[PDB]
Amino acid sequence: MQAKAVARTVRIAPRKARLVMDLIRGKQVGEAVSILNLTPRAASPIIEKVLKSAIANAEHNYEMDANNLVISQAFVDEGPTLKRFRPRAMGRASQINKRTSHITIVVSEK
């Protein structure tokens, strides 16, 4: 049995979220929460909320036991990019990609 949660179009760059995901992928949900709580990165509180949302789903919707859950899938996909422009010297503008992420966690019983 699996429970999934997704955060779609979160304003954080995918590369930056994936640094943190790599810490928790395959870990037990107890450990993963700890890691996220003590990892000082912008992505940590966002990924913590998805992870906790997945556990809640596992308990509420599917009567899984939160003590026996493991992160079975964890990935970040590119959301749509907000395109912005930074003015540079000599009247030139240069693009800025304010990238967004779709953050998925799947928990499952061990």
């Binding site: 640094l19 790599d22 810490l23 700890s34 890691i35 709580n37 003590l38 990892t39 990165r41």
Partner: protein, 55 residues
């Protein structure tokens, strides 16, 4: 100086071999049992070295 050739996906991925985070230097809090950074006050319960700090 500009790149003479674009970097292949493979060379980009080899370069990122070491671009990673480490797991926190974490240990179980003897007071409350939550994980804490070793040698720091436990944020959860405010204990350090078997004494409450945030008193």
């Amino acid at each position: 100086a500009v790149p003479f050739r674009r970097t292949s996906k493979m060379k980009k991925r080899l370069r990122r071999t070491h671009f990673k985070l480490n797991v926190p230097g974490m240990t179980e809090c003897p007071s409350c049992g939550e994980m804490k950074l070793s040698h720091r006050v436990c944020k959860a319960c405010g204990s350090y070295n078997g004494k409450d700090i945030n008193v």
